[PDB]
Design a protein around this ligand. Structure first.
Ligand code: HAS
Ligand code: HEM
Ligand code: CUA
Ligand SMILES: [Cu+]
Lengths: 33, 557, 166
């Protein structure tokens, strides 16, 4: 029928998660030199 | 010598019942020490309430060492051995080579009781890792090193069914579920090598007086070779349960036998060469062999990112089919009342902060921020303690009738899914305290209850773990209470004990059999494979088997 | 419906699978950028360096804990450090600010961790090897060495101390 908008949203969340996560810990690793 | 015609006409419907039930026992024991360890990191010393409640137990660490082996190694592999065998069977209908599929269970057992004895003694109280130089008992590295070998039989038995079917059906591709259990089983040999290597060529002789020392750079380089892939082992079976059984539990269909076949392909090629991710903090291994694994490691993430979409898209078709409203109406539509559905979906949920942390973990240098802190046991709880665990815990509520016959009473069901909702709630919170504590630097594996002002900036998350321990405790008891009623009730309604296995249909297209037909040269890959294990661990297991510097063992407990 | 939406469930798959490799590369980029600056000073030194544990608290750099610090450059100081079952040697290690510190840790005994609370200094120490790391404490304080790798019952208690002076 179309776009699986739902699954797009599910993989949209994993993406903000897989980022906020990676991204904050990059900050933490640079704060620590 | 049987009754239930059920087993006289399929007896591996039992070589599967036991493997499975040795498995959840092993869970019950371990997952006990857990509520207690939670409270530890909650900064609360409940270990004397424990010490006397099982005075066979000496140190906090005697526990973690139980909690580790039994849960990560025992319960998981035993579950890989119920599902990753018995499924390929019923999909080909063929009877697994029932002898070999029975030297398996008996093996497992003695290996388990061999390595239990010293373990409930204190003669191997050396963490799930059994890292050299701390030495263990002789009975530890045999037991364990017997237990693991069990799976090898299994590899046969499956590879066995795989070729009786290839040939009794010549030119028809491999079925989907067997095609999982094939590349999955073939992926485990090419991994296990490592730890079998380090058992044959190291732990065993030196566990037996046959040298006075182990080099640990290799004893722990060789151990991660197995050490990674293994989790994928821990994991891929419930990907299978999730790819090919959740959809139709949801009232949907896997929407691509191809995309699933590709996952499992990519898992074979990539779960074996990534071990140095474990070794970032180890020295003696070069920065580039390091860096070479960090990217491979980010690659193996490409199967799980995909499994995500395929499953979401898939829950959703199913969700709409059953009245699926607007942008999230699909969620509210699903079988939220059936734990075979809820257990893995809650699993898959917090599998989001799961993999994300994973991708931190593997991003080479970032590992220095989190390596050996609460962060890691927080990360794996999301993964094994929870997706894997709940996917198996929840796979009782349909695979258990289908293997005994006691169906699930609307008592049991509605218990089935409180157990499931606390474990998941428990795991989330625990997860938050653990990841946070770690970010503050609480080390892991540490009886921090007993150096109880050392970690004062971890106040409020320590509260989260307290909260967690209580909740998982309830949850675990509630679990015991309820596993026990469905292999104990003396109902025996055998007809749905022959319901064949709720496999989904498989939303099939045109651009299948090109691609599908590409990933079926099992062979070409099973070697593209090897070439990879070799190219990566090749260079080091040599700058290394050449500077064998072993040192003597110890026993600081 | 169903065969309209598998000519759509695979397209999106690479809408997605493309993106995911895109995103995963920005990562190996950013990972190497780190591998460019100082920061990756912390990476265990890779080229091997075998030594003996039963005799290291006997001869060689590791037996007199106050010979630990040794100016090995214009701006560098080396600290030979000893993580042993249930403490570190020296305690405190004293070292300068602005100054590149090459740590070279090792064991008389079991594997240990040398985890410098507040820095990126985090590194396995195997009885048999010389875990070599370099770090530039740009800021005075006493820091806390944390053992973060099980070595039997002493472990929750195994801490050391760094003092980088002004
Ligand atoms: C059971 C097991 C495990 C899985 C699976 C697992 C996955 C990964 N892990 Fe891990 N791990 C590491 C990296 C990864 C990566 C990159 C993956 C990847 O496979 C992760 C990929 C995951 C994703 C890419 C997310 C996919 C999301 C999905 C698939 C959910 C979709 C949602 C749906 C479908 C539902 C929505 C539904 C609705 C109804 C709305 C690294 C380092 O790079 C370390 C060591 C760090 C250190 O320094 O010690 C590590 C440490 C561990 C340890 C500790 C070992 C020890 O004791 O020393 C364990 C036990 C463990 C387990 C497991 N791990 N891991
Ligand atoms: C309520 C249930 C559970 C709780 C509360 C729990 C909690 C914990 C905690 C707090 C630790 C940290 C130990 C430490 O670093 O001191 C740990 C260890 C660990 N857990 Fe669990 N866990 C539970 C269930 C499980 C399950 C089901 C599995 C397997 C799927 C599992 C696998 C592991 C492994 C492999 C370790 C590593 C400990 C080691 O040897 O370092 N846990 N657990
Ligand atoms: Cu030394 Cu833990
Ligand atoms: Cu791994």
């Amino acid at each position: 029928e179309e776009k699986p908008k739902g699954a797009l949203a599910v993989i949209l969340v994993l993406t903000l998660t897989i980022l906020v996560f990676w991204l904050g810990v990059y900050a933490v690793f640079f704060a620590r030199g | 010598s049987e009754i239930s015609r059920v087993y006289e006409a399929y007896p591996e419907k039992k070589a599967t019942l036991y493997f499975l039930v040795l498995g959840f026992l092993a869970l019950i024991v371990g997952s006990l020490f857990g509520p207690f360890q939670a409270l530890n990191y909650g900064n609360v010393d409940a270990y004397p309430l424990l010490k006397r409640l099982l005075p066979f137990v000496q140190s906090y660490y005697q526990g973690l060492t139980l909690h580790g082996v039994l849960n990560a190694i025992v319960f998981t592999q035993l579950f890989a051995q119920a599902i990753m065998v018995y499924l390929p069977a019923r999909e080909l209908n063929m009877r697994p080579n029932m002898g070999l599929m029975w030297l398996s269970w008996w093996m497992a057992f003695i290996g388990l009781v061999v390595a239990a004895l010293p373990l409930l003694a204190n003669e191997a109280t050396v963490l799930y890792t059994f890292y050299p130089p701390l030495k263990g008992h002789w009975a530890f590295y045999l037991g364990a090193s017997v237990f693991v070998l069990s799976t090898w039989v299994s590899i046969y038995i499956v590879l066995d069914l795989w070729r009786r079917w290839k040939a009794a059906n010549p030119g028809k591709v491999t079925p989907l579920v067997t095609y999982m259990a094939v590349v999955f089983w073939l992926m485990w040999f090419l991994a296990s090598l490592g730890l079998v290597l380090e058992a044959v060529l190291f732990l065993l002789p030196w566990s037996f007086g046959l040298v006075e020392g182990v080099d640990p750079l290799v004893a722990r380089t060789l151990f991660w070779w197995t050490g990674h892939p293994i989790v994928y082992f821990w994991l891929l079976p419930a990907y299978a349960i999730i790819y090919t059984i959740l959809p139709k539990q949801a009232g949907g269909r896997l929407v691509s036998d191809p995309m699933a076949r590709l996952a499992f392909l990519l898992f074979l090629l990539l779960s074996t060469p990534v071990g140095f991710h474990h070794q970032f903090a180890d020295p003696g291994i070069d920065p580039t062999w390091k860096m070479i694994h960090s990217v491979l490691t980010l690659f193996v993430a490409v199967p799980s990112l995909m499994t995500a979409f395929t499953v979401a898209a898939s829950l959703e078709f199913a969700g709409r089919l059953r009245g699926g409203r607007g942008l999230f109406g699909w969620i509210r539509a699903l079988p939220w009342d059936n734990p075979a559905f809820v257990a893995p979906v809650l699993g898959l949920l917090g599998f989001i902060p799961g993999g994300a942390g994973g991708i931190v973990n593997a991003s080479f240098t970032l590992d220095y921020v989190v390596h050996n802190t609460a962060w890691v046991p927080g990360h794996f709880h999301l993964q094994v303690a929870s997706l894997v665990t709940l996917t198996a815990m929840g796979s009782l509520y349909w695979l258990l009738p289908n293997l005994t016959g006691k169906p699930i009473s609307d008592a049991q069901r509605r218990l089935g899914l409180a157990v499931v909702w606390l474990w998941f709630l428990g795991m989330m919170i625990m997860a938050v305290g653990l990841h946070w504590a770690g970010l503050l630097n609480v080390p892991r594996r540490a009886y921090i209850a007993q150096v109880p002002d050392a970690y004062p900036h971890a106040a409020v998350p320590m509260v989260f773990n307290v909260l967690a321990g209580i909740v998982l405790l309830v949850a675990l008891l509630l679990f015991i209470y309820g596993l026990f009623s469905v292999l104990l009730s003396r109902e025996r309604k055998p007809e749905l004990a022959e319901a064949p296995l709720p496999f989904a249909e498989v939303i099939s297209g045109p651009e299948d059999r090109r691609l599908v037909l590409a990933m079926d040269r099992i062979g070409f890959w099973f070697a593209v494979a090897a070439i990879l294990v070799v190219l990566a661990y090749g260079p080091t297991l040599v700058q290394l088997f050449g500077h064998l510097n072993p040192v003597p063992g110890w026993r600081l407990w | 419906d169903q065969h309209k939406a598998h000519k759509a469930i695979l397209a999106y798959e690479k809408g997605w699978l493309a993106f995911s490799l895109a995103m995963l590369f920005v990562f190996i980029a950013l990972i190497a950028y780190t591998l460019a600056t100082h920061t990756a000073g912390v990476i265990p030194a890779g080229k091997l360096e075998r030594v003996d544990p039963t005799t290291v608290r006997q001869e060689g750099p590791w037996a007199d804990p106050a010979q630990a610090v040794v100016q090995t450059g214009p701006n560098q100081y080396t600290v030979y450090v000893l993580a042993f079952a249930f403490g570190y040697q020296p305690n405190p290690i004293e070292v300068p600010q602005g100054a590149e510190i090459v740590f070279k840790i090792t064991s008389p005994d079991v594997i240990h961790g040398f985890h410098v609370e507040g820095t990126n200094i985090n590194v396995e120490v195997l009885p048999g090897e010389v875990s070599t790391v370099r770090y530039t404490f740009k800021r005075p304080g006493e820091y806390r060495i944390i053992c973060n790798q099980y070595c039997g019952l002493g472990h929750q208690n195994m801490f050391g101390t760094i003092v980088v002076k002004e």
